[PDB]
């Protein structure tokens, strides 16, 4: 059904599905089964910081997650992204929850996407930047039990008035309008996504994570897709 | 029923409906009838460029459009559009052909819109710059006779084969996304778009014009709004 | 000698050569008496972020300054730049204590310069964002007792080690490129800074101010220029 | 001496110095002799672009060169730049001619760089672009028989009155400012050059190229870098 390529910060190891025992990030191509993982110093309660890039010369998918005052984790996997994706894709984040949860609260998102063809001159480019979010953001999709608005923030999954992260939770928030990701006279096409998010649980073991996403444009929450698969699998293959 | 604001590149006089006696550069806030216009020396076959730039401090709307190698036109006008647009607006480009006809072509098109609010560092921006349109460019909304794709253009009314205008069409692209021009705590809203436009003739009288306008989002063509009426208005009061 | 054109965010009232009687955010034009001022509520110790804009169509300078849950202050006047600066000038922000002192340090600076031609596509550009100063910032030229890196801050005026601030400082940090503001055929030229501040002082009548200039670009500091002139005029004529 | 890093658009095959037989596109660690090279099919007389893109996660220096309507080419390298240049650099186009010649044009230059820290939010950036040159580019540091303003293009080269490329001839032009390539507690640095020229010759055989390159900041054209050595290397080692 859905192509989906995502980069996780995956929050629980379910070492059962191939997640290495800590928390990590992954480069996850139509799998929830990394393609390839890095260790994930996660902070519970701080604001991280998470950069994307990639670009078709290079075919090569980046990630670079940190904290202030710490070392960043990366992550990297050479992946021609024609190949696997529509040449218009919708990028959004996604987040869940399962029996152990966190609040999943992205405070800000930027995305710049840009394809350079070979006229002299001709630069396609789509940048957006939300530093806040409000209760009708009219641009952005809101899937399952995302919301916008609480302290200006996005919360991609549940979280009750006394600020109680709840479990069993899955959310998405897609940009309204589609990317553009290749194009026949491309001789380069590039992004770089930037989110700033707040992973905070109550318990000793949070879970599930945020992922980065990269979607056919009518992608949907696939049933059952809250836990361990990040709102974005419909299954653990 | 739609609000409307736009500046627009007339390029027939409609001397009875408040035209001055030239093409002329004007804008137009809910009626047809320009608040205020500018002489427009109008190149038949020429590639002019258009900016268009606004901010909520100053609360003026200003445009200049020129041709290289020649002087430019420029009008102003104090308005402040959060007393006349919705805080969620689409942006797009009409034209329009009469009796007299025209091609409204649409070479590039950039649009960059900025909300600042109190919050140190609190930006939201939306940027989107086309300097080629494909034949299924599904980021604009295509209204009437516009279409996508021939020589990597933005034909706004229709043009034959042979690369003839036609008279009696009507049309207008506007960017998929809503974009958020007022939000409450925002200290400074801006915007400035460019578009390069090609308007050429057979005849020595073109007709009837382009216009970059903003709208509220579910903006459709109003019915019989060819020739004068720039695809903008249902009439000429 | 030197030709000022600047946006002060003036802490301490001297009456005496025209400050109204509280904090104060005005514009300066080649002298330190306020072509216009605004009330400014200065709060001690918060982060303040300031916006300055200008083009030269409409040519009105305006700034707004706030704080975060605080309603922000504006001023804006009609001043041709063309008619007092150089087509080649330097950006900075400048800075001074007297008698009485605060720190004037600056945490993040951002400008853009744009200079659209009249040919189509010709655009001219400069940005440059610091969200961050290093103790060898090699493209800021630091006057009098602008200091970089502390806690990765630009110091504009003397702080000793325990924090404190000093009287009788000046210090000036402007950016190391000359900024093209007017060709001859521009058809618009504008630019926007914004930089976010923080004015601390132990005492209940901090001064000088901050000050956001634009100048000839071998501008440097007038000699007495401490205090009330803010390190950018060498009288208060 | 000099710490040079380029990509070379090599119009002339000095297969002595490892050349290929053929006009290529290569890149410079150093040494003239191109460390990659990729077969480059360059059209005498028309407007061909270049992008240039890195990245410090990926430590990849990838370059495209097009021309409109044909086919592009592109060279990659891994190489950490990191330890090859230092951390504040000066960027440039170089171009020379020697016994053949062809004119050296840049039409257009931009360029962007990004310093992204662990600090949440912490982005500093450099970008400028130049559409046009003005004879008194005060932004740009000429070295050698570079000049600015004849039809409002750089021409790194010596071309005489009747537009005759001149041989032995050597030409480099860096953007005024230092960049900042490095930072120790930046989690991601990248760059992206972009820039339009026009190679033209009337003979058979042009020569020597043009080169995008960044060096340390206070390099100057080398003695005897014209013809083969492109106005970056004393020597051919
Ligand atoms: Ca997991
Ligand atoms: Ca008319
Ligand atoms: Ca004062
Ligand atoms: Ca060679
Ligand atoms: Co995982
Ligand atoms: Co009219
Ligand atoms: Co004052
Ligand atoms: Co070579």
Same mark, same amino acid.
């Given at each position: 059904?859905?192509?989906? %390529?995502?980069?996780?910060?995956?929050?629980?190891?379910?070492?059962?599905?191939?997640?290495?025992?800590?928390?990590?990030?992954?480069?996850?191509?139509?799998?929830?089964?990394? &393609?390839?993982?890095?260790?994930?110093?996660?902070? +519970?309660?701080?604001?991280?910081?998470?950069?994307?890039?990639?670009?078709?010369?290079?075919?090569?998918?980046?990630?670079? %997650?940190?904290?202030?005052?710490?070392?960043?984790?990366?992550?990297?996997?050479?992946?021609?992204?024609?190949? %696997?994706?529509?040449?218009?894709?919708?990028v959004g984040l996604?987040?869940? =929850?399962?029996?152990? &949860?966190?609040?999943?609260?992205?405070?800000?998102?930027?995305?710049?996407?840009?394809?350079?063809?070979?006229?002299?001159?001709?630069?396609?480019?789509?940048?957006?930047?939300?530093?806040?979010?409000? &209760?009708?953001?009219?641009?952005?999709?809101?899937?399952?039990?995302?919301? =916008?608005? =609480?302290?200006?923030?996005?919360?991609?999954?549940?979280?009750?008035?006394?600020?109680? /992260?709840?479990?069993?939770?899955?959310?998405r928030a897609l940009?309204?309008?589609?990317?553009?990701?290749?194009?026949?006279?491309? %001789?380069?096409?590039?992004?770089?996504?930037?989110? =700033?998010?707040?992973?905070?649980?109550?318990?000793?073991? /949070?879970?599930?994570?945020?992922?980065?996403f990269?979607?056919?444009?009518?992608?949907?929450?696939?049933?059952?897709?809250?836990?361990?698969?990040?709102?974005?699998?419909?299954?653990? +293959?």
């Amino acid at each position: 059904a859905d192509t989906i %390529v995502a980069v996780e910060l995956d929050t629980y190891p379910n070492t059962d599905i191939g997640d290495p025992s800590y928390p990590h990030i992954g480069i996850d191509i139509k799998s929830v089964r990394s &393609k390839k993982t890095a260790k994930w110093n996660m902070q +519970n309660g701080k604001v991280g910081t998470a950069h994307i890039i990639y670009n078709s010369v290079d075919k090569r998918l980046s990630a670079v %997650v940190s904290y202030p005052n710490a070392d960043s984790a990366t992550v990297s996997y050479d992946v021609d992204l024609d190949n %696997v994706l529509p040449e218009w894709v919708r990028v959004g984040l996604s987040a869940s =929850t399962g029996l152990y &949860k966190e609040t999943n609260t992205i405070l800000s998102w930027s995305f710049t996407s840009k394809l350079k063809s070979n006229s002299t001159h001709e630069t396609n480019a789509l940048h957006f930047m939300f530093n806040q979010f409000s &209760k009708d953001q009219k641009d952005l999709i809101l899937q399952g039990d995302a919301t =916008t608005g =609480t302290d200006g923030n996005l919360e991609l999954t549940r979280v009750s008035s006394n600020g109680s /992260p709840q479990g069993s939770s899955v959310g998405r928030a897609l940009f309204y309008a589609p990317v553009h990701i290749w194009e026949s006279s491309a %001789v380069v096409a590039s992004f770089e996504a930037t989110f =700033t998010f707040l992973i905070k649980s109550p318990d000793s073991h /949070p879970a599930d994570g945020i992922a980065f996403f990269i979607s056919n444009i009518d992608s949907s929450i696939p049933s059952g897709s809250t836990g361990r698969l990040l709102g974005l699998f419909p299954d653990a +293959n």
